[PDB]
Design an enzyme around this catalytic site. Structure first.
Site, PDB file in Angstrom:
ATOM      1  N   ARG A   1     -17.883 -87.973 -16.610  1.00  0.00           N
ATOM      2  CA  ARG A   1     -17.591 -89.298 -16.491  1.00  0.00           C
ATOM      3  C   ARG A   1     -17.446 -89.414 -15.117  1.00  0.00           C
ATOM      4  O   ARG A   1     -17.687 -90.650 -14.167  1.00  0.00           O
ATOM      5  CB  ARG A   1     -16.339 -89.765 -17.180  1.00  0.00           C
ATOM      6  CG  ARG A   1     -16.682 -90.051 -18.586  1.00  0.00           C
ATOM      7  CD  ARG A   1     -15.235 -90.419 -19.408  1.00  0.00           C
ATOM      8  NE  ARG A   1     -14.582 -91.515 -18.744  1.00  0.00           N
ATOM      9  CZ  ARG A   1     -13.539 -91.897 -19.175  1.00  0.00           C
ATOM     10  NH1 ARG A   1     -12.641 -91.122 -20.132  1.00  0.00           N
ATOM     11  NH2 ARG A   1     -12.592 -92.836 -18.608  1.00  0.00           N
TER      12      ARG A   1
ATOM     13  N   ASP B   1     -12.349 -96.231 -13.291  1.00  0.00           N
ATOM     14  CA  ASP B   1     -13.318 -96.234 -12.255  1.00  0.00           C
ATOM     15  C   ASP B   1     -12.504 -96.989 -10.981  1.00  0.00           C
ATOM     16  O   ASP B   1     -11.763 -98.068 -11.365  1.00  0.00           O
ATOM     17  CB  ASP B   1     -14.442 -96.897 -12.757  1.00  0.00           C
ATOM     18  CG  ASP B   1     -14.438 -97.964 -13.352  1.00  0.00           C
ATOM     19  OD1 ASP B   1     -14.428 -98.858 -12.492  1.00  0.00           O
ATOM     20  OD2 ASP B   1     -14.752 -98.396 -14.536  1.00  0.00           O
TER      21      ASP B   1
ATOM     22  N   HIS C   1      -3.977 -98.069 -16.693  1.00  0.00           N
ATOM     23  CA  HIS C   1      -4.109 -96.631 -17.097  1.00  0.00           C
ATOM     24  C   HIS C   1      -4.464 -95.420 -16.459  1.00  0.00           C
ATOM     25  O   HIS C   1      -5.240 -94.490 -16.851  1.00  0.00           O
ATOM     26  CB  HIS C   1      -5.097 -96.732 -18.040  1.00  0.00           C
ATOM     27  CG  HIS C   1      -4.907 -97.742 -19.214  1.00  0.00           C
ATOM     28  ND1 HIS C   1      -5.929 -98.245 -20.477  1.00  0.00           N
ATOM     29  CD2 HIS C   1      -3.708 -98.513 -19.573  1.00  0.00           C
ATOM     30  CE1 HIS C   1      -5.163 -98.868 -21.218  1.00  0.00           C
ATOM     31  NE2 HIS C   1      -4.101 -99.317 -20.508  1.00  0.00           N
TER      32      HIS C   1
ATOM     33  N   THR D   1     -12.541-106.751 -22.468  1.00  0.00           N
ATOM     34  CA  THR D   1     -11.700-106.029 -23.059  1.00  0.00           C
ATOM     35  C   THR D   1     -11.701-106.487 -24.764  1.00  0.00           C
ATOM     36  O   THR D   1     -12.247-107.602 -25.020  1.00  0.00           O
ATOM     37  CB  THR D   1     -10.240-106.369 -22.658  1.00  0.00           C
ATOM     38  OG1 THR D   1      -9.541-105.258 -23.043  1.00  0.00           O
ATOM     39  CG2 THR D   1      -9.750-107.562 -22.754  1.00  0.00           C
ATOM     40  N   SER D   2     -11.517-105.362 -25.568  1.00  0.00           N
ATOM     41  CA  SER D   2     -11.726-105.673 -26.877  1.00  0.00           C
ATOM     42  C   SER D   2     -10.204-106.263 -27.605  1.00  0.00           C
ATOM     43  O   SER D   2     -10.599-106.472 -28.583  1.00  0.00           O
ATOM     44  CB  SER D   2     -11.928-104.332 -27.693  1.00  0.00           C
ATOM     45  OG  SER D   2     -10.794-103.363 -27.400  1.00  0.00           O
TER      46      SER D   2
HETATM   47  C1  LIG Z   1      -8.245 -93.619 -22.630  1.00  0.00           C
HETATM   48  C2  LIG Z   1      -8.217 -94.900 -21.491  1.00  0.00           C
HETATM   49  O1  LIG Z   1      -8.349 -94.500 -20.360  1.00  0.00           O
HETATM   50  O2  LIG Z   1      -7.969 -96.044 -21.954  1.00  0.00           O
HETATM   51  C3  LIG Z   1      -9.066 -96.870 -22.672  1.00  0.00           C
HETATM   52  C4  LIG Z   1      -9.261 -98.366 -22.407  1.00  0.00           C
HETATM   53  O3  LIG Z   1      -8.549 -98.435 -21.142  1.00  0.00           O
HETATM   54  C5  LIG Z   1      -8.726 -98.926 -23.433  1.00  0.00           C
HETATM   55  C6  LIG Z   1      -9.286-100.560 -23.985  1.00  0.00           C
HETATM   56  O4  LIG Z   1     -10.705-100.491 -23.841  1.00  0.00           O
HETATM   57  P1  LIG Z   1     -11.417-101.778 -23.221  1.00  0.00           P
HETATM   58  O5  LIG Z   1     -11.188-103.095 -24.007  1.00  0.00           O
HETATM   59  O6  LIG Z   1     -11.261-101.840 -21.694  1.00  0.00           O
HETATM   60  O7  LIG Z   1     -12.954-101.253 -23.630  1.00  0.00           O
HETATM   61  P2  LIG Z   1     -13.580-101.407 -25.090  1.00  0.00           P
HETATM   62  O8  LIG Z   1     -14.603-100.340 -25.618  1.00  0.00           O
HETATM   63  O9  LIG Z   1     -12.583-101.222 -26.174  1.00  0.00           O
HETATM   64  O10 LIG Z   1     -14.013-102.937 -25.103  1.00  0.00           O
HETATM   65  C7  LIG Z   1     -14.852-103.296 -24.122  1.00  0.00           C
HETATM   66  C8  LIG Z   1     -15.387-104.705 -24.451  1.00  0.00           C
HETATM   67  O11 LIG Z   1     -16.407-105.021 -23.696  1.00  0.00           O
HETATM   68  C9  LIG Z   1     -17.089-106.017 -24.035  1.00  0.00           C
HETATM   69  N1  LIG Z   1     -18.281-105.597 -23.195  1.00  0.00           N
HETATM   70  C10 LIG Z   1     -19.661-105.098 -23.368  1.00  0.00           C
HETATM   71  N2  LIG Z   1     -20.476-105.255 -22.492  1.00  0.00           N
HETATM   72  C11 LIG Z   1     -19.840-106.236 -21.718  1.00  0.00           C
HETATM   73  C12 LIG Z   1     -20.542-106.947 -20.613  1.00  0.00           C
HETATM   74  N3  LIG Z   1     -21.664-106.680 -19.997  1.00  0.00           N
HETATM   75  N4  LIG Z   1     -19.938-108.256 -20.166  1.00  0.00           N
HETATM   76  C13 LIG Z   1     -18.358-108.440 -20.772  1.00  0.00           C
HETATM   77  N5  LIG Z   1     -17.970-107.613 -21.693  1.00  0.00           N
HETATM   78  C14 LIG Z   1     -18.731-106.632 -22.375  1.00  0.00           C
HETATM   79  C15 LIG Z   1     -17.322-105.547 -25.567  1.00  0.00           C
HETATM   80  O12 LIG Z   1     -17.954-106.660 -26.384  1.00  0.00           O
HETATM   81  C16 LIG Z   1     -15.976-105.101 -25.654  1.00  0.00           C
HETATM   82  O13 LIG Z   1     -15.150-106.093 -26.403  1.00  0.00           O
HETATM   83  O14 LIG Z   1      -8.462 -98.302 -24.318  1.00  0.00           O
HETATM   84  C17 LIG Z   1      -9.136 -97.046 -24.039  1.00  0.00           C
HETATM   85  O15 LIG Z   1      -7.648 -96.248 -24.504  1.00  0.00           O
END
Ligand SMILES: CC(=O)O[C@@H]1[C@H](O)[C@@H](COP(=O)(O)OP(=O)(O)OC[C@H]2O[C@@H](n3cnc4c(N)ncnc43)[C@H](O)[C@@H]2O)O[C@@H]1O
Ligand SMILES: CC(=O)O[C@@H]1[C@H](O)[C@@H](COP(=O)(O)OP(=O)(O)OC[C@H]2O[C@@H](n3cnc4c(N)ncnc43)[C@H](O)[C@@H]2O)O[C@@H]1O
Ligand SMILES: [Zn+2]
Ligand SMILES: [Zn+2]
Lengths: 249, 249
Positions: A67, A101, A116, A186-187
């Protein structure tokens, strides 16, 4: 793209944003829950474990060095740029991110809270040492400490762990003072971040969600943009710079 | 748009720009030769005269007072914004402006050679004293001098006067290295500045002129973009930011 949406952003008193891995996806960085996350048939939630690092440090580090090399070569995409711009123009006061990142700072962003942690960070599993690196460590050989001599790990937050004290509070502050918040990529699941926007909504402030998919936050956000943060944010800030030209000055 | 132009800018090894008052118009600051330039029916050229100053220093200071009042309250426009943007991206190496207002730095520019002085500066006509104000001066009373007590003036350059110290050599060094120079909102009539681009050109360099009108520079410019620097500079700085993501990295 609406007049009210724009008027809202335009007339913000203290607008803040919360970004997730989705916001960096167009930069070629895999999200945490998308299919683009499967690494060797592993889901991210299976390696960012405190146990997984214990069960086998080798595998987890390979995943992180992998990564790291990617994030360290990646270029900040449009979405990143747009947030950096929105801060220059003075509208966005603070940017809260869950990503590890440094793609936001690479866009220019100044005020950034890393809920995080960062991949540039590598602290100790034994002592209290920690440092920033420039390159990804060839992982075959497990990383050891340049002091007390012991195992080193990614200076990021894993599940079950606890994010830096000071950090969450600073964020708790931003959203406790914000009137408008942009939640992008974010999800709306992992806590205690997901709860941050809900705070603003509680104090009356307004929520703007940017996400191709519908999320449990959607049902309550004031506005909801269905698209990639790259386009939406860019086309958005473009109309914001225009709306910014009105009244007194 | 044109991809050739974009390539030139995107691939430039050392790009510099020469701006003029045409780049501060969309901020509400009149140009030297435009219809908006007149003041009490007087023309700029016939008031920013060292003679016209000695002949009646009260009128000339009254004029400058009025101008400063405007600039010290005017806000940076899209062209200003964009030139600062192209500098953060690492493309614009140096911005050479003939504008005595301070809008470029405001937008964020860092490396700026002020070819013709500054309205932010007030130097004395006798002693070697010279300070920097931040607000307009009351016009009825002519400026003092906490050094020799002689009359004060704007730290700008008037016709027949010499340009500030190492300024000309600086810009002379910039354009003697420059492979590409963007020339925005300057009438290319006044020397020695109007010559700086010619330097680049006689070295096999590329001249991208941006001006609503045709100028003595137009027929030699590799690209003549006939439009307001506000819109041209904005669209251009956007294409470049994006296109700035290709090959090896
Ligand atoms: C372990 C760690 O470092 O921590 C992580 C991370 O920070 C956290 C939350 O995850 P996070 O919500 O940020 O990632 P997620 O994988 O949970 O969610 C990513 C979101 O991005 C959306 N997505 C994908 N492509 C996109 C684009 N081009 N533009 C806008 N949205 C897009 C997608 O639909 C989804 O809701 O949990 C994890 O535990
Ligand atoms: C004494 C002093 O203050 O020094 C000045 C000044 O620095 C110098 C040259 O004048 P300068 O060329 O910079 O001003 P000028 O007034 O001579 O020319 C301004 C140019 O800008 C163009 N222009 C007008 N509006 C524009 C817009 N919105 N976008 C882009 N271009 C626009 C216009 O067509 C014109 O050629 O001579 C003067 O002596
Ligand atoms: Zn240690
Ligand atoms: Zn003096």
């Amino acid at each position: 793209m609406d007049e009210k949406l724009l008027k809202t952003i335009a007339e913000s008193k203290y607008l803040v944003a919360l970004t997730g891995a989705g916001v960096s996806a167009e930069s070629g960085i895999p999200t945490f829950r998308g299919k683009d996350g499967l690494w060797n048939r592993y889901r991210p939630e299976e390696l960012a474990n405190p146990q997984a690092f214990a069960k086998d440090p080798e595998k987890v580090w390979k995943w992180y060095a992998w990564r790291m090399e990617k994030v360290f070569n990646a270029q900040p995409n449009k979405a990143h740029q747009a947030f950096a711009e929105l801060e220059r123009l003075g509208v966005l006061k603070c940017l809260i991110t869950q990503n590890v990142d440094g793609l936001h700072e690479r866009a220019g962003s100044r005020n950034v809270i890393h809920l995080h942690g960062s991949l540039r960070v590598v602290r100790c599993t034994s002592c209290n040492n920690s440092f920033e690196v420039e390159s990804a460590p060839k992982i075959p050989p497990l990383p050891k400490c340049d002091k007390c001599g012991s195992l080193l790990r990614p200076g990021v937050v894993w599940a079950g762990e606890m994010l830096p004290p000071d950090v969450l509070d600073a964020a708790m502050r931003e959203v406790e003072r914000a009137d408008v918040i942009i939640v992008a990529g974010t999800s709306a699941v992992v806590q205690p971040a997901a709860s941050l926007p809900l705070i603003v909504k509680q104090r009356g402030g307004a929520i703007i969600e940017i996400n191709p998919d519908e999320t449990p936050l959607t049902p309550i956000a004031d506005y909801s943009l269905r698209g990639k943060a790259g386009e939406v944010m860019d086309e958005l800030v473009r109309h914001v710079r225009k709306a910014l030209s009105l009244k007194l000055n």
